[PDB]
């Protein structure tokens, strides 16, 4: 059981860093939005265009990582 739950903890740590590192490195841009640094850190979206851009900002990727953080802890 401690094997299984230490790998659950490793799942939580690696997924929380996946969300946070992906928010920190795509903070300046991505192929969906190459000028994300022009809008700043916190902004809603870039509209419905290009498929839809809900939760595209780096703030919104901290945001989804707080859920996986509370999950891990």
């Amino acid at each position: 059981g401690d094997f299984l739950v230490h790998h659950a903890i490793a799942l939580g740590l690696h997924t929380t860093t996946l969300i946070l590192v992906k928010g920190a490195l795509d903070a300046r841009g991505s192929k969906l939005m190459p000028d994300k640094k022009d809008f700043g850190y916190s902004f809603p979206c870039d509209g419905p265009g290009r498929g839809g851009t809900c939760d595209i900002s780096a703030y919104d990727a901290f945001y989804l990582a707080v859920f996986w953080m509370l999950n891990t802890i």
């Binding site: 022009d38 809603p44 509209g47 265009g49």
Partner: protein
């Protein structure tokens, strides 16, 4: 008010003006494309920021670009 800038990648196909629900955008003479025309944003006081203009821009890495700025009673789209 929101910040609506356009860029010289404009092909002058005037789709942002037809897509604009607020008449912020209009087509101006220019000599950097085959259509001999480029957009403009003279009326960014009336912009809400709904970004229908840059759902309609065909150029890769959009030529029109709305930057969400301060919100007045016209930028919030209020009848009240």
């Amino acid at each position: 008010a929101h910040i609506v800038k356009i860029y010289d990648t404009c092909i002058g196909c005037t789709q942002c003006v037809r897509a604009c629900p607020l008449d912020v955008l209009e087509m101006v003479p220019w000599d950097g494309c085959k259509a001999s025309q480029m957009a403009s944003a003279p009326r960014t006081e009336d912009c809400v920021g709904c970004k229908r203009c840059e759902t309609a821009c065909p150029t890769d890495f959009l030529s029109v670009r709305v930057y969400l700025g301060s919100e007045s009673t016209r930028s919030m789209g209020l009848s009240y």
